[PDB]
A paper describes a structure:
AAC(2′)-Ia is chromosomally restricted in Providencia stuartii, an opportunistic pathogen responsible for catheter-associated urinary tract infections with a high mortality rate. This enzyme is a part of a larger group of AAC(2′)-I isozymes, which includes five enzyme subtypes (AAC(2′)-Ia—AAC(2′)-Ie). Specifically, AAC(2′)-Ia utilizes cosubstrate, acetyl-CoA, to detoxify naturally occurring aminoglycosides such as kanamycin, tobramycin, sisomicin, and gentamicin, as well as semisynthetic aminoglycosides such as dibekacin, netilmicin, and plazomicin through the addition of an acetyl group at their 2′ positions.
Amikacin, a structural derivative of kanamycin, incorporates an (S)-HABA group at its N-1 position, but lacks an amine group at its N-2′ position, making it impervious to the effects of AAC(2′)-Ia (Ki = 87 ± 10 µM). The crystal structure of AAC(2′)-Ia in complex with acetyl-CoA and amikacin, a non-substrate aminoglycoside, is allowing us to capture the enzyme in a pre-catalysis state. In the pre-catalyzed state, the adenine rings of acetyl-CoA are sandwiched in between two flexible loops, with residue Arg89 on one side and Lys121 on the other; however, this portion does not form any inter- or intramolecular hydrogen bonds. Amikacin’s interactions are similar to those between the enzyme and its natural substrates. Although interactions are maintained, especially at the prime ring, the slight movement of residues around the active site in the amikacin-bound structure causes deviations in the positioning of the central and double-prime rings of the aminoglycoside. Additionally, the N-1 substitution does not form any hydrogen bond interactions with the enzyme, and instead, residues Glu148 and Glu149 shift to make it so the enzyme can accommodate the (S)-HABA group in a conformation away from the active site. The amikacin-bound structure shows that the enzyme is also capable of adapting the (S)-HABA moiety in a second conformation. This second conformation, as displayed by amikacin, exhibits that the N-1 tail can also sit parallel to the aminoglycoside plane. The adoption of this conformation is based on the movement of residue Glu149. Surprisingly, when comparing amikacin with plazomicin, different interactions are noted at the N-1 site. Both amikacin and plazomicin incorporate the (S)-HABA group at the N-1 position; however, while this moiety in amikacin does not form any specific interactions with the enzyme, the (S)-HABA tail of plazomicin forms hydrogen bonds with Glu149 and Asp176.
Residue numbers in the entry:
A (entry chain A): -2 to 178
B (entry chain B): -2 to 158, 160 to 178
Amino acid sequence: GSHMGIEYRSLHTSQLTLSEKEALYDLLIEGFEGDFSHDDFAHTLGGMHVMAFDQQKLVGHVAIIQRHMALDNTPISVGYVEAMVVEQSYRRQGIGRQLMLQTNKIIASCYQLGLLSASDDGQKLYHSVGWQIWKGKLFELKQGSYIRSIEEEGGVMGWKADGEVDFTASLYCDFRGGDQW
Amino acid sequence: GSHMGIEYRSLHTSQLTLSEKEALYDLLIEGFEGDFSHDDFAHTLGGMHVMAFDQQKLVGHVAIIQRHMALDNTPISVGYVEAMVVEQSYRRQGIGRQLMLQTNKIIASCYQLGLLSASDDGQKLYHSVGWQIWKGKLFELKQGSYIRSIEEEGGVMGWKAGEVDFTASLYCDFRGGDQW
Ligand SMILES: CC(=O)SCCNC(=O)CCNC(=O)[C@H](O)C(C)(C)COP(=O)(O)OP(=O)(O)OC[C@H]1O[C@@H](n2cnc3c(N)ncnc32)[C@H](O)[C@@H]1OP(=O)(O)O
Ligand SMILES: CC(=O)SCCNC(=O)CCNC(=O)[C@H](O)C(C)(C)COP(=O)(O)OP(=O)(O)OC[C@H]1O[C@@H](n2cnc3c(N)ncnc32)[C@H](O)[C@@H]1OP(=O)(O)O
Ligand SMILES: NCC[C@H](O)C(=O)N[C@@H]1C[C@H](N)[C@@H](O[C@H]2O[C@H](CN)[C@@H](O)[C@H](O)[C@H]2O)[C@H](O)[C@H]1O[C@H]1O[C@H](CO)[C@@H](O)[C@H](N)[C@H]1O
Ligand SMILES: NCC[C@H](O)C(=O)N[C@@H]1C[C@H](N)[C@@H](O[C@H]2O[C@H](CN)[C@@H](O)[C@H](O)[C@H]2O)[C@H](O)[C@H]1O[C@H]1O[C@H](CO)[C@@H](O)[C@H](N)[C@H]1O
């Protein structure tokens, strides 16, 4: 739909054209001012994109990836939020909020828990739509064994749609290239 | 689109209505003759679905879910194929093949490797569209460390759209029920 003149579309990676993927990369690399690696780009591909347009130009994005984690010893399906960006001139105008409202709806309909790793900019937005900083320990796979993600603790945030999740439990994430969180 | 009198639609789990979800569950229960658990149903939700219809009746389905695995020591992004079924009276008319052609296209656009655990009904079909038996060892997480998935070896199949060593070990991500 469209909200205050911005069109929002929800598209799986498999539904994007090459031109649309190139436009997405340009938006993301600019939005992070270069702090966006090739591995970061891989991490935002493979799930659902919510994309914001002013006329025909892409001006905002967020992706929701499926991840498979453990909450303590229990398997938990995760909607992992990646690569939220609003083009500079469009910021503080509600686009990030609209992207997150649609992201929350996607997570609620598919997964048991939303997770993400926040920037300082992002944290205020995710707080405003009901996410909380994860309070428990974080673990990632290195060479096939779990190690503590000590530096990422305090930066990961979560959201439970249906009911309650123990924010103090330990999370064990699945393996990928680059940054695990 | 359409193919040979059957309509095909691709959609993400997040777009399913409750009625569509219930119809999918009923199709899977009937098509697997009940060999399909609540965990199996969870495993087919969260990714892309390709659905086949005779006019308005759901007659076929396959899902592609994103998984995060290790190939030996290297991370590999996986399109994991779940819950392919065609209603019994519609079988052997090419619906499964059309579902797999669309599945291959989704995997090729999104992931580095396709993987699935086969049934005897599907194995020759998967072979016919490029899939091959995984020859390497399979591992899964139990109590936070990897153990060999010995019973599943020989039944997992893979598809490379590139080059992939089909003798490498695969380390899958953690879920409930059957890991493969
Ligand atoms: C999971 C991840 O992707 S983390 C990475 C987040 N992305 C980045 O850091 C890239 C650079 N930054 C951006 O692209 C943007 O600043 C975003 C995406 C973080 C926010 O997008 P915006 O469209 O500006 O957010 P929006 O206008 O909807 O803000 C909604 C509320 O969130 C809060 N908020 C948003 N941005 C900020 C900010 N920079 N500082 C303080 N509060 C903020 C405010 O409460 C705001 O409400 P208000 O404007 O009425 O005070
Ligand atoms: C990853 C997974 O989902 S594994 C589980 C697969 N699903 C099941 O076992 C549920 C029960 N079985 C079914 O629903 C169906 O038998 C399916 C989905 C496996 C196949 O669906 P169909 O629509 O019948 O497949 P389709 O008609 O496209 O067959 C294409 C080719 O695959 C082969 N094939 C398909 N089914 C069989 C079979 N039961 N026995 C031998 N060969 C078969 C044949 O070579 C066939 O070509 P042909 O008909 O010209 O001889
Ligand atoms: N002290 C070390 C912190 C550790 O490196 C870490 O958590 N690092 C965090 C790793 C995450 N993958 C990053 O995720 C965010 O940005 C990525 C691109 N840069 C996107 O791909 C990702 O989709 C998004 O979600 C996140 O931004 C990083 O946060 C860190 O970098 C931010 C930018 O400077 C800071 O604002 C944060 N306070 C700081 O913790
Ligand atoms: N000997 C041990 C076999 C081991 O249990 C195993 O690999 N078991 C395999 C476990 C997989 N999760 C199953 O996956 C298939 O069927 C599931 C529903 N039953 C779907 O959810 C799944 O989406 C699909 O992909 C797969 O079919 C099972 O295969 C086994 O059961 C099949 C049906 O009887 C046989 O035809 C196979 N030859 C046999 O290996």
